[PDB]
């Protein structure tokens with residue numbers, strides 16, 4: 001058992017209510033922000049709105065701009081004991097319609113005609129976050145913390161992955177174990193992180209199509225940082241400007257974006273921690289970023305089905321770039337013969353199979369999609385990835401099964 005996903009939000013709201021929790025950047029730089037106290041109150045109001053609609057354990061879809069209230073809606077959905085279902089605002093209408101329907105969304109928070117031309121399921125109650133009436137009703141809800149006593153395995157979010165997309169059900173326990181495991185890893189490899197409460201910032205750069213965006217905001221809150229974000233086209237336009245002008249101290253990026261932009265550590269003067277993942281980094285990226293004594297560079301392995309990042313390791317100038325490090329928190333990595341449940345001798349190639357608190361609940365209504373299973377009566381996920389363990393038990397990524 002674990003503290004809930006919104007635990008650190010509530011904790012910093014009590015101990016340091018004036019710290020900034022979220023900030024959204026315009027202009028391109030003008031910004032606006034909310035304190036932990038304000039973020040937490042608004043999320044409780046959102047949660048109370050949801051509870052008044054009698055929704056429990058229901059899919060609540062969100063298709064919003066990059067706004068302060070978006071963050072409060074996400075947290076609110078989780079405080080109300082319901083499931084967050086991100087739907088990227090730029091998706092084609094047909095694909096938005098499918099996600100609403102497949103997820104059985106009971107309610108949706110939208111703005112900006114993001115749902116214009118989307119077929120809504122009749123069950124979907126649609127709230128426009130920019131509508132004077134919705135704002136007035138929200139401001140009228142109670143602001144105290146919700147009594148948060150939901151089962152551990154209750155879904156916290158549903159994240160769709162690929163021609164018919166399948167929904168991955170991620171539990172409260174999964175997400176809260178993620179925050180705990182990464183709080184520990186990041187605090188260890190980038191100790192300045194424990195000094196940055198109230199000052200540092202975690203750049204929320206990921207598209208809402210990926211679980212990474214959830215990780216970014218909850219890791220910011222874990223450490224007392226400000227989650228900072230903007231319209232993605234605007235943040236990506238001049239990536240050095242974004243890191244430099246928004247005071248970013250922590251970020252996650254796919255490394256080819258470092259290559260394309262020519263980013264170096266001096267373009268991000270406040271940066272102390274840089275997670276990369278999702279593809280192998282190039283030799284020059286490694287040379288440039290792995291030798292800094294200010295920035296800790298960490299390679300992260302993270303299928304959606306195992307909650308954002310379940311293995312990671314610091315990358316140094318002599319590290320193999322296929323190394324995905326060691327399992328996080330209580331996770332246990334096994335390397336099994338691709339066709340059986342038999343462990344291979346350490347050092348041999350085989351399929352990576354993860355066990356532990358980061359393994360997701362499963363796919364939503366996709367009985368033929370494989371990967372989740374019981375192996376020796378424990379819950380595991382077979383990644384489809386071929387790896388081998390190094391002598392020191394770190395894991396090298398070799399390819400796809």
Ligand SMILES: [Cl-]
Nearest residue numbers: 004006078079
């Ligand atoms: Cl929560």
